[PDB]
Design a protein around this ligand. Sequence first.
Ligand SMILES: *[C@@H]1O[C@H](CO)[C@@H](O)[C@H](O)[C@H]1NC(C)=O
Lengths: 51, 151, 202, 51
Amino acid sequence: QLPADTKDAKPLLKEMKRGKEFHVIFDCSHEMAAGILKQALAMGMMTEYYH
Amino acid sequence: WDPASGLNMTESQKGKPANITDSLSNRSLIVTTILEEPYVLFKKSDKPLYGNDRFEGYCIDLLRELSTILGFTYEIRLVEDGKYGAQDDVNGQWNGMVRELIDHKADLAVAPLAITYVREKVIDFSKPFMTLGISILYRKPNGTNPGVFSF
Amino acid sequence: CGIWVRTSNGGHFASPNYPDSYPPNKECIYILEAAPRQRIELTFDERYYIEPSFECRFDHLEVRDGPFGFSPLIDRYCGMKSPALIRSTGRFMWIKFSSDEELEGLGFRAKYSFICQFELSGADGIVRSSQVEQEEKTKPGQAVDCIWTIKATPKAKIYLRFLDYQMEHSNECKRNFVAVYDGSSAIENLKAKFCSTVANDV
Amino acid sequence: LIDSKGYGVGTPMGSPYRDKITIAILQLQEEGKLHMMKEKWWRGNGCPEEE
Ligand SMILES: *[C@@H]1O[C@H](CO)[C@@H](O)[C@H](O)[C@H]1NC(C)=O
């Protein structure tokens, strides 16, 4: 679950990359979708492996 | 259960500790030896050894053969102090291995053990697996002929 | 990262690049040494006061009392909360700050206040066995233990060779053992510990 | 001696004499008297014909 506040997936996305979790579904008002893709790119998650 | 502590289940320590008198078991056997050199020695290693594997010896793998052909358990418990089991007259005691051959703290004690007259009086010994005896030790001569008259 | 803060009644102790986010991949030591009979009071100033809902690894500031390494673990702090002030009379609060491979934070600010280890460095030398009746004469009755610090020449890794090793008092080591630590002197990484007849070189 | 072996005293699987005769044999060994009987039977005619 996304933390309710701070919109900060850095802990969350780090947890994700730890498990080598190469598939994700989302559920969010698309604002959060955009605001989190930038997070993913900054964390370098943006590699052709994830879909 | 509480929000704070958790489940104080009363079985964490069972009221009646389960106990069964007769179940599958092995009859373990205690042997008593000594750190004699080409007989029984600490196995050579750098990492720690544990249990019976700390040792090594010609005697110990002899016991390995014995247990292999008859079936036993290894409690290689060393003697307290270095001594051929030999009684004392004054104390009447049998300090050394003979204690464990008497007091049934232990069992058969495989180690350098001369089956002598007094020992069989107080212990029972199997027939010797290898004989012994006394010889002289000497430095073999060297090519330093006297040469006063080496002709 | 090293800010040698030795011999101060008080002084500033802080994470590198403190007002900025701390750099990544940094495993840097800090050591606080107190003179005999003194007390160490460590003041720690948090930059940011929030309440996290979780505790995690990858960025942890632990505190150790004594020979870094031997030192029993006191506690292992993380997050953005300010740890409570630590008062002990162990006289050696030695504190290590780590770093993961990413995910830097606001860092930290601290303030130290004040109220058997022999140096042995160079190019070559020998650690005298049981050499304790001269350095720190410890009576034989109690358990004794000591640590030895090596510093090679600048740009020099070190090789050790044991000339004489015999720990009679057991094959096991729940009482007596000899061990080697690489890196700096922490419990972080045992290069090796020796409990048997033979001790290999390292 | 390529191999080592000796002799014995045959007794039935139940024999009260086995242990006591073992004791006596060992004791005689201590005095080495059995050695002297052997020598009278061996050494006596051992070397009266040393060539
Ligand atoms: C568990 O129950 C026992 C008996 O009522 C009580 O003495 C003990 O304090 C309890 N412990 C906890 C964790 O609540």
